[PDB]
Amino acid sequence: HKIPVEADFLYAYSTAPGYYSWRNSKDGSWFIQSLCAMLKQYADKLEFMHILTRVNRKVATEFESFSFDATFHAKKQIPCIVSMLTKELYFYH
Amino acid sequence: DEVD
Amino acid sequence: SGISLDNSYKMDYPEMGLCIIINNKNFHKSTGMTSRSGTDVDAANLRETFRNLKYEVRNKNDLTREEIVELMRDVSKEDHSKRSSFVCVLLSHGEEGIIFGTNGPVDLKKITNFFRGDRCRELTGKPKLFIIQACRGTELDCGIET
Structure with missing residues (x-):
């Protein structure tokens, strides 16, 4: 008859805890680029967590950093879905 | 490719 | 009626809701933080993407810490x-x-607390989504070959 005050939040983080997040000055950030493509392609078909799982794979597989600085070259990124949701979320009805 |  | 299931959020209210986009590109020189080239591309991509999901999008640009807090306070107290x-x-x-x-x-935590189930009764039991494109530290993922 009560719910927790922290229930029904979802935190779609661009990167894992502790890590840099990559942004491309021409294309936009890897995370936002992929999130928007997956929303457009799947928001009328998939539940939100399954969309966000496709964002994870897209960011994980299709992006790799290129830098003249060895320290920052050839690096990867995985986003971090944090769910306190109590129900499934579909953008359609 | 830039970090934030 | 017949049997029913409560496994999904009610998403058929008259409005899908607000989509607040905070696009911080340029930072006061005294902070020593660099400009975030390409974030306008993100901001416009998000605005169009959530527009087509029928969200009421509000783009805000280059907000101070105080402005972020006030905006979150004000938005939480809307109907x-x-x-x-x-x-x-x-x-x-x-x-x-x-x-x-x-x-x-x-x-x-200061931002999300405005929408806590007890502090924002307008949204209790409704999904509150925070999408965060920002660094979480300075670690770099070297990856591994597949």
């Missing part, structure tokens, strides 16, 4: 009775638990 959900997209520098206004940091 959400006709709204299904709430989305806030944050685009900025950050570190673990923190995102930056143009003039300094804001604790993520």
Whole structure:
């Protein structure tokens, strides 16, 4: 008859805890680029967590950093879905 | 490719 | 009626809800933080993407720490009775638990607390989505070959 005050939040983080997040000055950030493509392609078909799982794979597989600085070259990124949701979320009805 |  | 299931959020209120996009590109020189080239591309991509999901999008640009807090306070106190959900997209520098206004940091907890089930009764039981494009530290993922 009560719910927790922290229930029904979802935190779609661009990167894992502790890590840099990559942004491309021409294309936009890897995370936002992929999130928007997956929303457009799947928001009328998939539940939100399954969309966000496709964002994870897209960011994980299709992006790799290129830098003249060895320290920052050839690096990867995985986003971090944090769910306190109590129900499934579909953008359609 | 830039970090934030 | 027949048997029913309560496994999904009610998303058929008259409005899907607010989509607040905070696009922080340029930072007060005194902070020493660099400009976030390409974030306008993110901001416009998000605006169009959530527009087509039928969200009421509000783009805000280059907000101070104080302006972020006030905006979140004000938005939380709006009438959400006709709204299904709430989305806030944050685009900025950050570190673990923190995102930056143009003039300094804001604790993520301070932002999300405005919408806690007990502090924002308009959204209790409704999905509150925070989408955060920001650093969470300085670690780099070297990856592994597949």
